Scaffold this motif. Structure first.
Motif, mmCIF file in Angstrom:
data_model
loop_
_atom_site.group_PDB
_atom_site.id
_atom_site.type_symbol
_atom_site.label_atom_id
_atom_site.label_comp_id
_atom_site.label_asym_id
_atom_site.label_seq_id
_atom_site.Cartn_x
_atom_site.Cartn_y
_atom_site.Cartn_z
ATOM 1 N N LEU A 145 -0.305 -6.786 -9.938
ATOM 2 C CA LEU A 145 -1.643 -6.257 -9.728
ATOM 3 C C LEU A 145 -1.553 -4.779 -9.368
ATOM 4 C CD1 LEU A 145 -3.746 -8.417 -10.195
ATOM 5 C CD2 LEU A 145 -4.273 -8.382 -7.753
ATOM 6 N N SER A 146 -2.383 -3.962 -10.008
ATOM 7 C CA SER A 146 -2.312 -2.523 -9.809
ATOM 8 C C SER A 146 -2.933 -2.119 -8.478
ATOM 9 C CB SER A 146 -3.016 -1.781 -10.947
ATOM 10 O OG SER A 146 -4.421 -1.959 -10.877
ATOM 11 N N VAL A 147 -2.424 -1.024 -7.919
ATOM 12 C CA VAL A 147 -3.006 -0.389 -6.746
ATOM 13 C C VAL A 147 -3.376 1.039 -7.119
ATOM 14 C CG1 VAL A 147 -1.814 -1.846 -5.073
ATOM 15 C CG2 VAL A 147 -0.738 0.269 -5.862
ATOM 16 N N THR A 148 -4.454 1.535 -6.517
ATOM 17 C CA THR A 148 -4.965 2.868 -6.802
ATOM 18 C C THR A 148 -5.183 3.610 -5.492
ATOM 19 O OG1 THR A 148 -7.230 2.013 -6.889
ATOM 20 C CG2 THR A 148 -6.038 2.201 -8.976
ATOM 21 N N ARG A 149 -4.656 4.829 -5.405
ATOM 22 C CA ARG A 149 -4.767 5.639 -4.203
ATOM 23 C C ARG A 149 -5.178 7.057 -4.572
ATOM 24 N NH1 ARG A 149 -2.688 5.005 1.007
ATOM 25 N NH2 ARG A 149 -2.682 6.935 2.250
ATOM 26 N N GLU A 208 0.836 -1.194 0.000
ATOM 27 C CA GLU A 208 0.000 0.000 0.000
ATOM 28 C C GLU A 208 0.875 1.250 0.000
ATOM 29 O OE1 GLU A 208 -3.431 0.323 -0.151
ATOM 30 O OE2 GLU A 208 -3.299 -1.799 -0.697
ATOM 31 N N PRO A 209 0.630 2.204 -0.894
ATOM 32 C CA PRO A 209 1.505 3.378 -0.981
ATOM 33 C C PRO A 209 1.399 4.256 0.257
ATOM 34 C CG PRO A 209 0.205 3.078 -2.991
ATOM 35 C CD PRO A 209 -0.409 2.217 -1.934
ATOM 36 N N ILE A 210 2.420 5.091 0.436
ATOM 37 C CA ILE A 210 2.550 5.946 1.610
ATOM 38 C C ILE A 210 2.931 7.347 1.150
ATOM 39 C CG2 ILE A 210 3.981 6.445 3.632
ATOM 40 C CD1 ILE A 210 4.120 3.375 4.062
ATOM 41 N N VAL A 211 2.239 8.351 1.677
ATOM 42 C CA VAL A 211 2.515 9.737 1.318
ATOM 43 C C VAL A 211 3.703 10.245 2.123
ATOM 44 C CG1 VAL A 211 1.581 12.063 1.182
ATOM 45 C CG2 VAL A 211 0.095 10.095 0.771
ATOM 46 N N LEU A 212 4.696 10.790 1.424
ATOM 47 C CA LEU A 212 5.761 11.531 2.086
ATOM 48 C C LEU A 212 5.399 13.009 2.064
ATOM 49 C CD1 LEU A 212 8.820 9.627 0.590
ATOM 50 C CD2 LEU A 212 7.661 9.252 2.779
ATOM 51 N N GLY A 213 6.074 13.784 1.221
ATOM 52 C CA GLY A 213 5.706 15.160 1.001
ATOM 53 C C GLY A 213 4.431 15.267 0.193
ATOM 54 N N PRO A 214 3.885 16.478 0.090
ATOM 55 C CA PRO A 214 2.674 16.674 -0.714
ATOM 56 C C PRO A 214 2.877 16.208 -2.149
ATOM 57 C CG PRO A 214 3.090 18.600 0.643
ATOM 58 C CD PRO A 214 4.293 17.707 0.791
ATOM 59 N N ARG A 215 1.840 15.569 -2.692
ATOM 60 C CA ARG A 215 1.795 15.066 -4.063
ATOM 61 C C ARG A 215 2.797 13.948 -4.323
ATOM 62 N NH1 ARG A 215 0.714 20.522 -7.735
ATOM 63 N NH2 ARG A 215 -0.435 21.700 -6.137
#
Length: 196
Positions: A87-91, A10-17
């Motif tokens: 398999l793709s992930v979407t966030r 699962e992706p994780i946000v660091l800085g904005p965008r």
């Protein structure tokens, strides 16, 4: 290279965008020499990135468009070529205040009484809205704060009528768009000085 399988976390946000994207590998690991990550808005064309090492099992996507859905896939690469797509992930990328002003701000005489103006505008450029526009802020600033005029308008509005301008005073008229995240950048001012 076809037997290897990529497992996307699962992706994780660091800085904005940004999105920190990581994955594990199962199969003949010795064959992989790197990874090709691809991403698109969930849309447009895919954007590709080449990773030159088999140990780089993570990357940081940057400058992702706020208020959109980002779709991410990753495949392994080697001397044969590219392997099976994971398999793709979407966030969702969180909305932000608009980074571009409303377009084509104009002022015309008109409204209540003898010294009113109508301010009209168009939405910001689509790439600068950073989300669904829910509000417009309209300012008419004089040289002192007691002369300021301000109105709010809905996201479907393209005009606002401001009354009570003092003749002879120089006013800076500005419009800004807002999303759920806040009020964005204001337009370049349209200067107005009614005759006295």
């Amino acid at each position: 290279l076809a037997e290897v399988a990529v497992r996307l976390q699962e992706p994780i946000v660091l800085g904005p965008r940004t999105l920190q994207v990581s994955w594990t590998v199962d199969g003949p690991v010795q064959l992989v020499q790197g990874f090709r990550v691809s991403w698109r808005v969930a849309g447009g064309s895919w954007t590709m990135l080449d990773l030159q090492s088999p140990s780089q099992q993570s990357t940081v996507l940057r400058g992702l468009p706020p208020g959109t859905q980002i779709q991410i896939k990753v495949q392994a690469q080697g001397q044969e070529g590219l392997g099976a797509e994971s398999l793709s992930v979407t966030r969702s990328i969180p909305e932000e205040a608009p980074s571009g002003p409303p377009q084509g701000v104009a002022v015309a005489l008109g409204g209540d009484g003898n010294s009113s103006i109508t301010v009209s505008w168009e939405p910001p450029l689509p790439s600068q809205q950073n989300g669904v526009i829910t509000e417009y802020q309209i300012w008419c600033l004089g040289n002192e704060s007691r002369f300021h005029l301000n109105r709010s308008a809905a996201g479907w509005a393209r005009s606002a009528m401001l009354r009570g301008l003092v003749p002879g005073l120089l006013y800076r008229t500005l419009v800004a768009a807002a999303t759920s995240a806040g009020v964005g950048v204001p337009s370049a001012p349209v200067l107005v000085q009614l005759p006295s």
